[PDB]
Design a protein around this ligand. Structure first.
Ligand SMILES: Nc1nc2c(ncn2[C@@H]2O[C@H](COP(=O)(O)OP(=O)(O)OP(=O)(O)O)[C@@H](O)[C@H]2O)c(=O)[nH]1
Ligand SMILES: [Mg+2]
Lengths: 169, 871
């Protein structure tokens, strides 16, 4: 039971750091730009059997874009990552969304506001309009403090499988 | 160029090989293929061969990605031939996967936007395919994405050429609208609306023409018919919202405005039809249309209410939506409400109607067992409600609403879930309510304390939070302090109520510290057995913080006595011995006990052992250093700490030792008795530091170390600069600083740009004092030696290494360099501009002129900005 998950968003927003949190359990301070794409199978044990996510961690930096759109084929779900501490990253969220729906239409897409741990927030959770529509959802997350760091996958699982009751174990 | 057999092979791996390590490698080879010159020829062939869906998407996408990035490497003559290819390709593959049709559509649009020799492209495309019914689906797809691509960051069309584009489309906006009518005469229907909506969003459609046009009528038509599918519905809604948004001035677009206003009002019936059924998808769309409608005609509702455009059925439609049992429906309208309140008597009744609607949305399920959880989806919603109420409460009156909410909590024998929800909204506003009218305020508090223990847990919980929000009323009415505390004392002793109580107690302690001295006896006794109440770490810390805030206000005599008791329980527990929690509890006590060194002596020995036991564990050490930081916040600790710091750091390079070091320098750096010892610490700390950064990827792997090292250096350069400048260690610091300029880690880079700025500025700042000439010479030496290497490094990072957000920090450093020696800098900059790998000599020249001739720092940043774009 596996799903192709494309992870998109501006560079330095915390995409790869977020994955490493799940993959190894280790929070990583360093910032190493992803080259093109980086595939990581993430397996979560649930109360209804194991679920594997084939996470496609794409690059945010224009120089290391890789195939960009080419990575999107046959995606079943996606996570759009932006920085809570960076206004310019949230401004680009519409363009990322537009790119996905031009390749993958009506797939479950989660908006993720990362680095909510930061003292001075520059993007208010109130102003977000993404979760107001359905098929779309938002979660305040933090790869450092692990705040709601499992929410996006659990939500996507409930959408991909189709069971609201489903829980992680 | 690679063989055709190889790319078909690499594609099947990338799309079917389950292994991650292999899938990445195929990706990279295909990646290098797109960047290469061979990409054009291969892609064109793949689409002609059309083996399968996988390879055709890649070729079409590559076609698009090569047109929007590598358009420059095409001879003018090739343009016409490439266009014929893409149009032939999209023809042949028109019934293939839709995801392939889009990419080709995108490619043609991106091509057209960059091809001025293809004038009247809108006209060309339509009259070639409009009559073929099977051509229509991809023609529309191109027509939809074309206006969207005009603001493409991937294309980044010049400002003048972009303006030409938009007005060129406006010219032909008639032709596509005309076409869009022929088109609709379900799958096809929604394609039409999306296309219509897209041209609306560009703001190039004629309001007056669209005002009287069948397309508009068709929009509201399908939005009225109950039989219409979910997909046609969403498309129609989105197009309506696009129509409304495109209206910037209602007056200039009055024909269109009136048509749309009347149109959406006819949907109220369709709304009721959708809510009669369980069609939640449809109602969310209607609620979106309504909220968008009120935003557009907000001005008319305000200026001439009730009359025409100001027809108050608009606000009513929202209050109906507000009444909906599904909470995902009402939050859609929250932003308008914010905006309505923001612009703001006629509305008052509407806002108070809304508040009652939100009050009921906060009602928990009658079978709810525990406390209201904040983490879940619904607890988040309650907060969004709480925040919205705070911002609108001024339209009712914080005295009017607070009293009114409380009054309705005795009539009709209110069930527990109705009480909790009313208490919740009261707590939301309990802070903003003016404590002038105390009687109505102070009687609410008396009501909450007389609540029996028998009431539902969740009612006890929210009432504790309400009391917590009412700390200003306990400050103005000190008699209620003892009853309030006692009530909170009961909640603290109940496990699921503990955290809420501890938080509420802390609020009281902070505001009512002036006369809290009596109760301190109790607070200490809570601390003495803190881990019995099953508290959260946050609630625990917050509790100890409170008692420490009032201890500082106690009589000086009893302070030293009670402080030692507060810490002894912690010390004895550590002595018995993961110490993190007690380290964190010690730290907060010190942090807010600000009326001490007598107690510090008792603490130091157990901390040193704790630090040394877990000297390998960064997380514990980090909490350890935080603790030690606040204890200082006492020269008897200095040397035994510095020694231990250096010794631990020697084997475990915890960067928090650097930061802790920076604190000692910030606090004792001005004391010339310490200046030598502090410099020794720095020189000692730098040795294991440089060892870390000397390693491969040393800067990338320890950005935390880079950040904290230069915070230390910065504290030095602003507390005792001369001590650092005459030292020998300042030279490798500066070198690493210069090396650190290419570190893309944002936090660490701000710190580095900060040290360089503050360092160079020392040769300029405060020329009024005597030692200025010494500092002037020391920097002059430094600038002589390294000045040319810094400027070259700074210029390098701006153009190739770091993201645009660093520019103001670099510009600030560059500015200080000109303050030290501008004529020399003018020479330096020419060398930096000399070594560059394109960019015309004219551009380098006028860049040099702007920067070197800058009179404000602002001018340097813009100068860097424009030049940086070139790379
Ligand atoms: N405070 C805080 N910092 C974070 C958090 N998550 C990530 N960061 C920082 O942000 C950086 C994220 O690096 P990456 O995840 O590799 O960047 P990215 O999102 O993958 O962007 P690309 O590399 O272009 O794909 C890390 O170096 C962290 O220092 C967080 O939750 N809290
Ligand atoms: Mg990455």
């Amino acid at each position: 039971v596996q799903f192709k998950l494309v992870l998109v968003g501006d560079g330095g927003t915390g995409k790869t750091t977020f994955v490493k949190r799940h993959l190894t359990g280790e929070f990583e301070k360093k910032y190493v730009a992803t080259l093109g794409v980086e595939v990581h199978p993430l397996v979560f044990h649930t109360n209804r059997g194991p679920i594997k996510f084939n996470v496609w961690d794409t690059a945010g930096l224009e120089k290391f874009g890789g195939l960009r759109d080419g990575y999107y084929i046959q995606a079943q779900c996606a996570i759009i990552m932006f920085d809570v501490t960076s206004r310019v990253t949230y401004k680009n969220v519409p363009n990322w969304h537009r790119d996905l729906v031009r390749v993958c239409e009506n797939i479950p897409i989660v908006l993720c506001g990362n680095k909510v741990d930061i003292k001075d927030r520059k993007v208010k959770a109130k102003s977000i309009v993404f979760h107001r529509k359905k098929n779309l959802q938002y979660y305040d997350i933090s790869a450092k403090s692990n705040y709601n760091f499992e929410k996006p996958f659990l939500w996507l699982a409930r959408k991909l499988i189709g069971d609201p009751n489903l829980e992680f174990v | 160029k690679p063989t055709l057999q190889l790319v078909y092979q690499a594609v099947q791996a990338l799309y079917h090989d389950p292994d991650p390590s292999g899938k990445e490698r195929a990706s990279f080879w295909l990646g290098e293929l797109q960047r290469s010159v061979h990409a054009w020829e291969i892609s064109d062939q793949l689409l002609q061969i059309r083996q399968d869906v996988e390879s055709c998407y890649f070729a079409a996408q590559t076609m698009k990605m090569k047109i929007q990035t590598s358009f420059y490497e095409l001879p003018t003559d090739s343009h016409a031939s490439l266009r014929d290819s893409l149009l032939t390709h999209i023809q042949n593959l028109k019934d293939l996967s839709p995801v392939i049709v889009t990419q080709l559509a995108l490619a043609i649009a991106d091509l057209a936007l960059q091809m001025p020799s293809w004038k009247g492209c809108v006209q060309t495309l339509v009259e070639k395919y409009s009559n073929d019914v099977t051509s229509l689906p991809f023609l529309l797809e191109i027509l939809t994405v074309l206006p969207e691509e005009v603001h493409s960051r991937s294309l980044r069309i010049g400002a003048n050429r972009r303006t030409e584009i938009i007005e060129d489309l406006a010219f032909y906006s008639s032709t596509v609208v005309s076409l869009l009518m022929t088109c609709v005469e379900e799958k096809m229907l929604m394609k039409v609306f999306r296309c219509l909506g897209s041209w609306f969003n560009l703001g190039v459609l004629d309001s007056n023409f669209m005002a009287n046009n069948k397309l508009l009528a068709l929009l509201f038509e399908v939005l009225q018919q109950d039989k219409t599918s979910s997909n046609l519905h969403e498309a129609a809604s989105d197009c309506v919202c696009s129509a409304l948004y495109a209206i910037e001035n209602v007056e200039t677009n009055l024909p269109l405005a009136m048509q749309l206003f009347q149109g959406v009002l006819t949907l109220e019936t369709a709304y009721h039809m959708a809510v009669a059924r369980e069609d939640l998808d449809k109602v969310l769309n209607y609620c979106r249309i309504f909220t968008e409608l009120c935003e557009t005609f907000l001005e008319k509702i305000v200026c001439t209410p009730g009359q025409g455009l100001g027809d108050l059925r608009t606000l009513e439609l929202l209050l109906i939506c507000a009444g909906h049992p599904q909470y995902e429906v009402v939050e859609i309208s929250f932003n308008f409400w914010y905006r309505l309140g923001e612009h703001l008597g006629i509305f008052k009744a509407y806002i108070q109607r809304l508040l009652h609607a939100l009050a009921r949305h906060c009602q928990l399920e009658p079978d709810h067992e525990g406390v209201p959880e904040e983490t879940d989806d619904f607890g988040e919603f309650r907060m969004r409600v709480s925040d919205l109420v705070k911002d609108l409460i001024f339209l009712i009156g914080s005295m009017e609403c607070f009293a009114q909410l409380y009054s309705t909590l005795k009539e009709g024998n209110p069930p527990w879930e109705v009480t909790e929800a009313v208490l919740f909204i009261m707590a939301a506003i309990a802070k903003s309510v003016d404590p002038e009218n105390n009687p109505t305020l102070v009687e609410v508090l008396e009501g909450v304390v007389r609540l029996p223990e028998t009431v539902h847990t969740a009612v006890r919980y929210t009432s504790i939070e309400l009391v917590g929000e009412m700390s200003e009323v306990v400050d103005r009415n000190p008699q209620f302090l003892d009853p309030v505390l006692g009530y909170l004392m009961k909640g603290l002793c109940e496990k699921p109520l503990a955290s809420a109580a501890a938080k509420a107690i802390h609020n009281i302690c902070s505001v009512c510290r002036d006369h809290m001295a009596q109760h301190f006896n109790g607070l200490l006794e809570i601390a003495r057995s803190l881990d019995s109440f099953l508290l959260s770490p946050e609630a625990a810390v917050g509790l100890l913080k409170g008692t420490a805030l009032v201890l500082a206000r106690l009589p000086l005599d009893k302070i030293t006595e009670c402080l030692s008791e507060l810490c002894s329980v912690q010390v004895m527990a550590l002595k018995k011995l993961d110490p993190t929690v007690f380290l964190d509890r010690l730290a907060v006590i010190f942090r807010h006990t600000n009326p001490c060194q007598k107690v510090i002596q008792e603490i130091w020995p157990v901390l040193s052992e704790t630090l040394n036991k877990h000297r390998a564990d960064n997380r514990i050490v980090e909490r350890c250093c935080r603790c030690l930081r606040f204890a200082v916040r006492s020269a008897a600790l200095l040397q035994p700490l510095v020694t231990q710091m250096v010794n631990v750091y020697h084997v475990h390079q915890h960067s928090c030792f650097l930061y802790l070091g920076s604190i000692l320098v910030d606090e004792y750096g001005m004391e010339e008795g310490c200046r030598q010892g502090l410099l020794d610490m720095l020189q000692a700390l730098c040795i294991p530091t440089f060892q870390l950064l000397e390693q491969q990827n040393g800067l990338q792997n320890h950005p935390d170390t880079v950040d904290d090292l230069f915070r230390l250096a910065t504290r030095f350069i602003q507390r005792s600069p001369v001590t650092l400048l005459r030292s020998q260690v300042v030279i490798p610091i500066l070198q690493w600083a210069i090396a650190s300029t290419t570190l893309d880690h944002r936090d660490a880079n701000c710190s580095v740009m900060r040290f360089l700025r503050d360092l160079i500025h020392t040769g300029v700042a405060n020329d009024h004092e005597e030692d200025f000439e010494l500092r002037k010479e020391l920097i002059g030496q430094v600038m002589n030696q390294l000045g040319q290497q810094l400027v070259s490094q700074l210029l390098h990072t701006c153009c190739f290494c770091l993201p645009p957000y660093t520019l103001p920090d670099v510009a600030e450093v560059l500015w200080e360099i000109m303050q030290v020696d501008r004529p020399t800098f003018c020479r330096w900059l020419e060398n930096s501009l000399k070594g560059l790998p394109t960019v015309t000599h004219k551009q380098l020249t006028d860049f040099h002129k702007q920067v070197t001739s800058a009179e404000e720092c602002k001018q340097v940043c813009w100068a860097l900005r424009d030049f940086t774009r070139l790379f």
